[PDB]
Every structure is written in structure tokens, then in C-alpha cells.
Design a protein around this ligand. Sequence first.
Ligand SMILES: O=C(O)C1=C[C@H](O)[C@@H](O)[C@@H](O[C@@H]2[C@H](O)[C@@H](O)[C@@H](O)O[C@@H]2C(=O)O)O1
Ligand SMILES: [Ca+2]
Length: 135
Amino acid sequence: ASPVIYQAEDAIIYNAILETVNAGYTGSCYVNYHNEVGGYIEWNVNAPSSGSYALIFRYANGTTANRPMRITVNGNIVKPSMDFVSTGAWTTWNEAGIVANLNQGNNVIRATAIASDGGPNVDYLKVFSANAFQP
Ligand SMILES: O=C(O)C1=C[C@H](O)[C@@H](O)[C@@H](O[C@@H]2[C@H](O)[C@@H](O)[C@@H](O)O[C@@H]2C(=O)O)O1
Ligand SMILES: [Ca+2]
């Protein structure tokens, strides 16, 4: 199966907004976190079969400082501190990814901002099967 893109507009967001300010996003918009601890973006992600999947965030970080996020799958912490390092400009969009085990059906995937400047700007979450890799 082709990778599935979970667009910004389809997320459940908390202390974050959907905006269009910085060029280079895809689809209708991207998420801009409030500049505070604890904002999050959450998607309901389908897994056709149980197994290992790549979860890739397309993101921008126009500050020099890492904007780490806590990644949970169904509330389970799979990455306590996932790095979202500077991309240099707010219009430069890079990828940051992890491999995680998902269950057949829905998986609740959340990225929560750890530090006080909030999370990176997030364009989408891209999900594809990565059975060759093992979390
Ligand atoms: O998260 C940010 O720090 C951030 C996200 C925006 O997408 C950027 O354009 C940039 O905006 C800042 C600031 O947060 C915003 O409130 C407004 O004052 O514009 C600023 C800017 O640098 O243009 O930063
Ligand atoms: Ca922000």
C-alpha cells in the first residue's frame, strides 16, 4: 500500500492552531503550536495489519533551538523526547520520523510539546508499513 498522509486539518489539536502563514506547507494548512508547554496534535491512524510502521512528521522549525516532543501511541510513550531540530527557516520543511508498532485498526498518535517554546510547525504525519524495521 502507498503511504497515507494525515493532513493537519484532520488532526485533533490542543493549544495549537491551523494556519497558512509560512510558505511550503502542503494541503490546506499546517499546525502552529502555542508557544508553551503541553500543546499537542493527535491523529487517528489506521493500520491495515498489526506491525511496524514509519511515522514521519513533515515539520518546520525556524528557531535555532530543538523543539522536542513526547510521542504516544494509544497513550503509551513510544518516544519520551523526539527531536525536531532547526530547519533554518520557517519556510524550510524537513522530516523527523520514528518506527512504532501499531495495532490493526485505529491507533491514537499524539505529539506533545515538551518545552516552553512549544512544538515545531507540523505540515502532516505520513504513515507507511516498515516491517523491515523493528521498534
Ligand atoms: O512557533 C513559532 O515560534 C513561530 C511560528 C510561526 O509560524 C512563525 O511564523 C513565527 O511566528 C512568530 C510568532 O510566533 C507569531 O506570534 C508572530 O508574532 O510572528 C512571529 C514571526 O516570526 O513572524 O514563529
Ligand atoms: Ca508555534
